[PDB]
């Protein structure tokens, strides 16, 4: 299927003393592969996936040069936004940025992104066609006009449709053991009595990759949501993910209930019966 490369940048001002905390992480799909932290000792972009370790020193010097340039930019941007929003120098404020690209199964550019939030709210974002901007408010209209006047979209597009996908292609090849492997969920169902007259069925999906998954209960062939409980999908810590969904049913009636699992690593959905 498709694959995505994503970069997430967070910059938080520290008005008590010093410059903003800046954290940048790079992802291919649900796998982190690089990180930069302004409060870490290296002051370098660092490897977070074995397959990125194959890149030599020129890559790391390049990535470090750029990531630090990004840091300064966010630093300047926080200053800029505090001004736009007439905020005092005394509050702590946050800038968040995300950009990246997807390739389809044909390995070609499919989609690109570039979006910006201030203090946890939409600020400005590049539209799907990568030619124009979505400005959330009047402050953002300033950014929109400046960026349109300086043809930033075009430059961004050239990256997202070009060099962005070239890197993604390269990473997918070099890390093919893991990046292009799908780990189908290991599923089982547990049963516990909660009374003399009803029981809890819990259907588990463990150790799957990627994170995207659908778990649903059926009763006599129909979706059931009443009397169900679930958890949001969670990282297992070893690079895989976990989820369960539970239902409470009259003791003796378990045969009615089926758990349904959909995941990219499964040719067909799974059905589990007690």
């Amino acid at each position: 299927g498709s694959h995505s490369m994503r970069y997430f940048f967070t910059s938080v001002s520290r008005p008590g003393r010093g410059e903003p905390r800046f954290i940048a992480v790079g992802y291919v799909d649900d796998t982190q592969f690089v990180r930069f932290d302004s409060d870490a000792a290296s002051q370098r972009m660092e490897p977070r996936a074995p397959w990125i370790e194959q890149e030599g020193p020129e890559y790391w010097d390049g990535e470090t040069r750029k990531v630090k340039a990004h840091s300064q930019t966010h630093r300047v941007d926080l200053g800029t936004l505090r001004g736009y929003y007439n905020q005092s120098e005394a509050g702590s404020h946050t800038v968040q940025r995300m950009y990246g690209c997807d390739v389809g199964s044909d390995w070609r550019f499919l989609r690109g992104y570039h979006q910006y939030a201030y203090d946890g709210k939409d600020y400005i974002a590049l539209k799907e066609d990568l030619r124009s901007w979505t400005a959330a408010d009047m402050a953002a209209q300033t950014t929109k006009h400046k960026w349109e006047a300086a043809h930033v979209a075009e430059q961004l597009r050239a990256y997202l449709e070009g060099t962005c996908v070239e890197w993604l292609r390269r990473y997918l090849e070099n890390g093919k053991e893991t990046l292009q492997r799908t780990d189908a969920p290991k599923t089982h169902m547990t049963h516990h009595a909660v009374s003399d007259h009803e029981a809890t069925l819990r259907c588990w999906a463990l150790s799957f990759y990627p994170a995207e998954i659908t778990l649903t209960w059926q009763r006599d062939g129909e979706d059931q949501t009443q009397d169900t409980e679930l958890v949001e999908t969670r990282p297992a810590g070893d690079g895989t993910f976990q989820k369960w969904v539970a239902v409470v049913v009259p003791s003796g009636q378990e045969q009615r209930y089926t758990c349904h699992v959909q995941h990219e690593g499964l040719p067909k959905p799974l059905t589990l019966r007690w």
Binding site: Y59, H70, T73, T80, Y99, I124, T143, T163
Partner: peptide
């Protein structure tokens, strides 16, 4: 790899 551009707000 990162984008070399990053324009300022």
């Amino acid at each position: 790899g990162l984008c070399p551009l990053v324009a300022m707000l």
